[PDB]
Amino acid sequence: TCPFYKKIPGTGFTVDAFQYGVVEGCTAYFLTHFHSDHYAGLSKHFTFPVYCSEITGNLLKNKLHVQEQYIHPLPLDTECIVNGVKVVLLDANHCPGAVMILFYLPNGTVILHTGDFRADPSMERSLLADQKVHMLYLDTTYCSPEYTFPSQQEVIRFAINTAFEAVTLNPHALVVCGTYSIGKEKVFLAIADVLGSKVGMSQEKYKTLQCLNIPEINSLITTDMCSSLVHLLPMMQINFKGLQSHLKKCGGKYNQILAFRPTGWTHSNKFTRIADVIPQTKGNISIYGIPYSEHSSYLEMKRFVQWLKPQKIIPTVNVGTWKSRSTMEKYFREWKLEAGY
Numbered sequence: 001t002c003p004f005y006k007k008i009p010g011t012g013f014t015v016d017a018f019q020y021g022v023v024e025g026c027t028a029y030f031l032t033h034f035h036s037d038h039y040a041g042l043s044k045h046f047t048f049p050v051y052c053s054e055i056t057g058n059l060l061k062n063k064l065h066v067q068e069q070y071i072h073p074l075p076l077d078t079e080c081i082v083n084g085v086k087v088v089l090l091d092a093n094h095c096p097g098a099v100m101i102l103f104y105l106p107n108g109t110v111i112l113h114t115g116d117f118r119a120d121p122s123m124e125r126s127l128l129a130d131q132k133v134h135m136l137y138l139d140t141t142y143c144s145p146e147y148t149f150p151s152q153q154e155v156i157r158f159a160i161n162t163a164f165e166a167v168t169l170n171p172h173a174l175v176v177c178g179t180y181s182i183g184k185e186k187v188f189l190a191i192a193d194v195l196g197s198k199v200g201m202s203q204e205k206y207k208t209l210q211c212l213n214i215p216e217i218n219s220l221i222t223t224d225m226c227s228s229l230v231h232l233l234p235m236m237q238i239n240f241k242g243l244q245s246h247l248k249k250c251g252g253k254y255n256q257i258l259a260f261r262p263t264g265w266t267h268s269n270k271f272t273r274i275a276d277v278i279p280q281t282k283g284n285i286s287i288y289g290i291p292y293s294e295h296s297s298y299l300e301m302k303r304f305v306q307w308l309k310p311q312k313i314i315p316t317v318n319v320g321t322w323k324s325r326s327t328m329e330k331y332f333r334e335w336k337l338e339a340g341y
C-alpha cells in the first residue's frame with residue numbers, strides 16, 4: 001500500500017509510486033527520475049498514464065519497454081494542464097532527466113515536490129521566484145550538519161588533474177570509472193576529454209547513455225573497448241580482484257590501472273579535504289573514492305528552504321525511524337526560528 005508522502009492531496013496524482021499495484025483513485029502517475037528505488041514496479045505491461053521529462057520517457061521506452069501510448073513527456077519551465085490541474089516541471093540538478101514538480105491545486109494551495117535534488121542558488125531564479133509554496137515534499141538524504149562535501153566543479157578538477165598526471169607519467173596506464181545507475185556522467189566524460197579518448201563500455205550501458213540527450217554524444221562514447229583508454233565498469237567490479245581480472249582481458253596493452261569510485265558522502269569527509277585525498281593501492285592498481293554528490297549538502301538544503309519559506313515540510317528520505325524523523329523536525333524548526341517565517 002502507497003504511503004501518504006507519495007500522494008498529492010486534492011488531486012488524482014501520485015509521485016514515484018509504481019511498486020504498490022493499482023493505487024485507488026490515481027488517474028496520473030508522475031515519475032521524477034530514472035533511479036530504481038523510484039521507478040520500482042514499472043514494465044511493458046503498465047497501462048496507466050505516466051508523466052515525466054523527455055529524457056525519463058526515452059529511458060522508460062528503451063530500457064523498461066513501457067508502451068509509447070502511456071508515456072507523457074512534458075517540457076521543462078512550461079505551465080501544463082494535466083487532468084484539469086496546472087503543473088510545472090523544473091530541473092532538479094540530480095541525474096539526467098530528473099525534475100521537481102510544482103502543483104497548483106484547485107483550492108489555491110501550491111505544492112513543490114523536489115524528487116531527488118541538489119539545491120542550488122540558481123533555483124532562486126527559476127519559476128519558483130514568482131509565488132508562494134504552502135507545502136514542500138523534500139529530499140532529506142543529507143539533512144544533518146555532518147554531511148559536508150565539495151562542489152561538483154572541485155571534484156571534477158581533482159579527477160581530471162589526477163588522471164592527466166598519471167597517464168602522462170605512464171602512457172601504458174588504463175583509467176577505469178565505476179557506474180551502477182545514471183547520474184555522475186561528468187566524472188568519466190571530463191577524464192576522457194582531457195586524455196583525448198572516447199569512453200569504452202558495454203552495449204547495455206551505451207544504450208542507456210544514448211537515451212540522455214547529451215550534445216555530441218556520438219563523439220564521446222564507444223562500445224569498442226580496444227580503441228579507448230577510459231573504460232566503464234559496473235561499481236561492483238571496482239576492487240583489486242575485479243580490476244586484476246579486467247587488466248588480463250586487455251591483451252598486454254596496459255601495465256597499470258587507475259580507478260575512480262564516485263560515492264556519495266563517506267565519513268572520510270569529516271577529516272580530509274579533496275586536495276588531500278589518497279587512493280588505496282595494491283601493486284600496479286590504485287583506487288580513488290571521490291565524493292561526487294547529486295544530493296544537497298546540509299548547508300545547500302538549509303539555504304534553499306530558508307529562501308523558499310514553506311508553511312509545511314514533508315520529508316521523503318530517512319522517514320523509517322523515530323530518531324531520524326525527530327532529528328529532521330528539530331532542524332526544520334531551527335531554520336524557521338532563525339529566518340523568521
Ligand code: NI
Nearest residue numbers: 033035094116
Ligand atoms: Ni535519485
